[PDB]
């Protein structure tokens, strides 16, 4: 028991940049410190932006700030609390049977706005900065327009799906792919996101 370790923090360790005309990732912090961050909890990096990137010690992904809840998926972060400024922040939503966990979203983050237009032309924003268009299929999936080798898409899980108006339609969960080729995305709906807010 005495010897029994403590898994850390889910760690920002940069974003993608949406605020112009041209979507670039930017690393914020190196493996050193974000493994240091992860132990104690304490980040007092500035956050910006809606799209951020973060580390566990063993995986990176997305996470996507909607009407102030910084989200992402339950297969990358599982339970573990956010570094933030003042130490480490518990989970306000985890839900495993949706893939879904939320945090209070950082202080300088911005957020995406629900979806209400009922479009179906999406874009998909992943870890590299890539925005692929996306056609929704049904409430939870879409297809690629040009589909992607299943490398291109891993450690974009917790990225948003957008509207052509910028709105946030979903989070991105899952790639359905067949000889590894990524044809259509599984995604969390925004709706559900609003009824687990419920
Ligand atoms: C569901 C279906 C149709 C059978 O398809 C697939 O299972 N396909 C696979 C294809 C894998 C190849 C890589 C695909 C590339 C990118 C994928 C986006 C991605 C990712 O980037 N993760 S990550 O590297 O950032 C990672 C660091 C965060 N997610 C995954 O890999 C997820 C993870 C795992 O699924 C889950 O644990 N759960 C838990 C769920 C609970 C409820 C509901 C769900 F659906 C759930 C899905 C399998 N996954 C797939 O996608
Ligand atoms: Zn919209």
């Known amino acids: 028991m005495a010897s029994m370790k403590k898994k ?12 112009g005309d041209t979507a670039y990732a930017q690393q914020t912090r190196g493996e050193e410190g974000c493994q240091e961050t992860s132990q104690t909890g304490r980040d007092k990096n500035q956050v910006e932006g809606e799209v951020q990137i973060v580390s ?12 102030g809840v910084l989200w992402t998926v339950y297969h990358g972060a599982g339970t573990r609390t956010i570094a933030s400024p ?9 839900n495993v049977d949706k893939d879904l966990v939320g945090w209070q979203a950082p202080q300088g983050s911005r957020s995406l706005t629900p979806c209400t237009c009922g479009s179906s032309d999406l874009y998909l924003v ?9 056609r929704r299929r049904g409430d939870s999936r879409g297809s690629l327009l040009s589909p992607r080798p299943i490398s291109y898409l891993k450690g974009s899980a917790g990225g948003p799906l957008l509207c052509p108006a910028g709105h946030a339609v979903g989070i991105f969960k899952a790639a359905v792919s067949t000889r590894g080729v990524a044809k259509a995305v599984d995604f969390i709906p ?6 687990t807010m419920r």
């Open 190 to 195: 925004v709706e559900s996101l609003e009824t």
């Open 86 to 94: 003042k130490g480490p922040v518990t989970q306000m939503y985890t």
């Open 8 to 19: 850390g923090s889910v760690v920002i360790v940069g974003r993608i940049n949406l605020s």
């Open 56 to 67: 566990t010690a063993t995986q990176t992904f997305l996470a996507t700030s909607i009407n």
């Open 126 to 134: 992943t870890r590299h900065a890539d925005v692929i268009p996306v």
